[PDB]
């Protein structure tokens, strides 16, 4: 009885999430939705077919068993049996994840939701929905990506050695392999550039983008970003959000990671000695793998909590993710 | 309402565990026991007084409010209100932790137990007690030290990026500051030397020890050890125990850590790329801090699970520890 799961969003992240699920024996992808269509197959999605439909014909509604629809998310919820969904949605507008969650609250569907949100303020909009989620019978796992997520959890574990936390420093690197199937979401990173914000970045043209990325050989270096690692670690009682600082480099013109992603956790131990733990990711673990891997680990953990009748909102920092086989 | 906790064992580890609890506001040490005596103080232990009694007069039963007893563990259980205990016991004989747990099962006391066991086979003896523990109303957290524990949990998190795990390699270093208050437990490490075993190591004299440690300037280099990280990660469905290999260096003649403790997690991602995550501990995080810190993090996590009516046996690999303030 493998977990029947769905993906909402079929840009680069959701496509990678679909590929990641293929060989799992204990997780079965039955449901995808994009803006313009949805695909359900209780016997398991043809990812080849769905990625074809999307990239060639603009939506998975064009897939062999696909349905076109401007209510894809509303239609797919009531369409068949899905234990959990990964919300691989961009947060555009900044309310969209919260709005999609309100559709899930409103639908009377129960089960597990996971996101890979990045921005403190989007995670806050989901905090306000804590009781709504509980009451609806939904276990919601928020910030269960790479950062927040994998790295947030690593810091939460690392923190146990210390009487007091001083700094959680996250430095991430990202190399874009395929420009096509990232330039849909590149504006989420441009929004973290100094001078910019989501509204300004989202209104930019392919031209205004390429004109910016030309200034640096396709390198976005983003400094002290709005990253929900800060509140997740604070709700877990580890440190104040202000002691969490997140920074990153994306190389748009190189598949190779421009630096080793890591989290440095600094604190003082009970003996009054000050020291740092360091969790480093392999350079050949892609963004897709470091996001979607934890995402479905959390989805499985979420189902464990859901099954025991534990509902509400959980962060990467609160629960141990479960290896999906 | 801080958690009322106890320590069983007052060698080096339990003494450090007591010091670690002092400044906590949300955890109150009310109970210690050694072989020959016990100390209870519902208003909070005088650690200065207890460490004095133990080191100077041979037992904490000699402490200001102490009681001498050859049934210290049996007497302290029924003595007052304790939410959880850290079993800072050496596993000597190899059944002792399991035997103490049977006293706890038998006592009809309910709450949280945590250990920092090291040996796969001792952790197995506690697996056999799974239902006994559940039925008794006890949440038992096993292998919640440094390794197994902190490092086991780190690997469990790290594993999420990968379709398949190849190797979990743990390399640990330990520098002994105070020879006095380690030579009580040094024989647990000597047992991992090649030729040796617990029975042979435990029968050794201060002389036979010093004659061994003289051969290497006080350096035990222990290779492919029996370490319960292997079964904990297997029960968590991450990998086979045979893909977990644990090795270490203790420098008996230097407080300074003889190498950086770390865990290397190697696997293949869904894209077929092979890579390693690396979790490294600060050189100035002591053994005491890397053991007792996670131990009480797990004790708190254990109370969270206990409070929700979740009983049975949990490993470091199964649950997120909770920062104790
Ligand atoms: C979010 C950060 C991507 C995570 C990097 C993880 C890794 O090292 O693979 C992006 C900037 N949208
Ligand atoms: C168990 C290993 C001690 C853990 C080392 C952790 C660190 O780096 O502080 C000993 C060998 N009894």
Curated annotation (Swiss-Prot), chains A, B:
The keyword Nucleotide-binding applies. It is an enzyme of class 2 (transferase). The active site is at 118 (nucleophile), 188 (proton acceptor), 192 (proton donor and proton acceptor). It catalyses: (8S)-8-amino-7-oxononanoate + L-lysyl-[protein] + CO2 = (S)-2-amino-6-oxohexanoyl-[protein] + (7R,8S)-8-amino-7-(carboxyamino)nonanoate + 2 H(+); (8S)-8-amino-7-oxononanoate + L-lysyl-[protein] + NADPH + H(+) = N(6)-[(2S,3R)-2-amino-8-carboxyoctan-3-yl]-L-lysyl-[protein] + NADP(+) + H2O; N(6)-[(2S,3R)-2-amino-8-carboxyoctan-3-yl]-L-lysyl-[protein] + CO2 + NADP(+) + H2O = (S)-2-amino-6-oxohexanoyl-[protein] + (7R,8S)-8-amino-7-(carboxyamino)nonanoate + NADPH + 3 H(+); (8S)-8-amino-7-oxononanoate + L-lysyl-[protein] + NADH + H(+) = N(6)-[(2S,3R)-2-amino-8-carboxyoctan-3-yl]-L-lysyl-[protein] + NAD(+) + H2O. GO terms for molecular function: NAD binding; NADP binding; oxidoreductase activity; transaminase activity. Keywords: Aminotransferase, Biotin biosynthesis, NAD, NADP, Nucleotide-binding, Transferase. Transmembrane segments: none annotated. Disruption phenotype: Loss of biotin biosynthesis. Has 2 domains; discontinuous domain I (residues 1-149 and 291-331) forms a nucleotide-binding domain while domain II (residues 150-290) binds substrate. This is (S)-8-amino-7-oxononanoate synthase BioU. The gene is bioU.
């Amino acid at each position: 009885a493998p977990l029947r799961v769905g993906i909402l969003g079929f840009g680069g992240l959701g496509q990678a999430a679909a590929r990641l699920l293929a060989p799992k024996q204990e997780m079965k992808l039955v449901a995808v939705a994009d803006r313009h269509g949805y695909l359900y197959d209780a016997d398991g999605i043809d990812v080849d077919n769905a990625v074809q439909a999307y990239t060639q014909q603009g939506s998975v509604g064009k897939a062999k068993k696909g349905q076109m629809s401007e209510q894809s998310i509303e239609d797919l919820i009531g369409e068949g049996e899905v234990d959990g969904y990964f919300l691989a949605l961009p947060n555009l507008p900044n309310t969209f994840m919260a709005d999609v969650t309100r559709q899930f609250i409103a639908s009377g569907w129960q089960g597990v939701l996971v996101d890979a949100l990045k921005r403190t303020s989007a995670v806050e909009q989901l905090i306000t929905l804590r009781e709504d989620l509980a009451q609806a019978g939904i276990t919601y796992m928020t910030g269960c990506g790479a950062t927040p997520g994998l790295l947030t959890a690593a810091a939460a574990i690392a923190s146990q050695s210390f009487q007091e936390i001083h700094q959680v420093k996250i430095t991430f690197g990202v190399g874009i392999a395929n420009w096509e199937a990232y330039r849909a979401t590149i504006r989420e990173d441009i929004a973290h550039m100094p001078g910019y914000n989501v509204d300004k970045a989202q209104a930019m043209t392919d031209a205004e983008v390429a004109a910016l990325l030309d200034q640096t050989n396709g390198i976005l270096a983003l400094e002290d970003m709005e990253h929900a690692d800060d509140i997740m670690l604070e709700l877990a009682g580890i440190c104040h959000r202000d002691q969490v600082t997140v920074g990153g480099v994306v190389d748009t013109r190189n598949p190779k990671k421009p630096l080793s992603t890591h989290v440095k956790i600094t604190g003082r131990t009970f003996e009054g000695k000050i020291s740092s733990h360091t969790f480093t990711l392999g350079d050949e673990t892609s963004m897709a793998a470091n996001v979607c891997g934890p995402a479905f680990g959390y989805l499985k953990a979420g189902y464990g909590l859901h099954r025991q009748g534990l509902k509400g909102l959980f962060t990467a920092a609160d629960v141990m993710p479960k290896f999906v086989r």
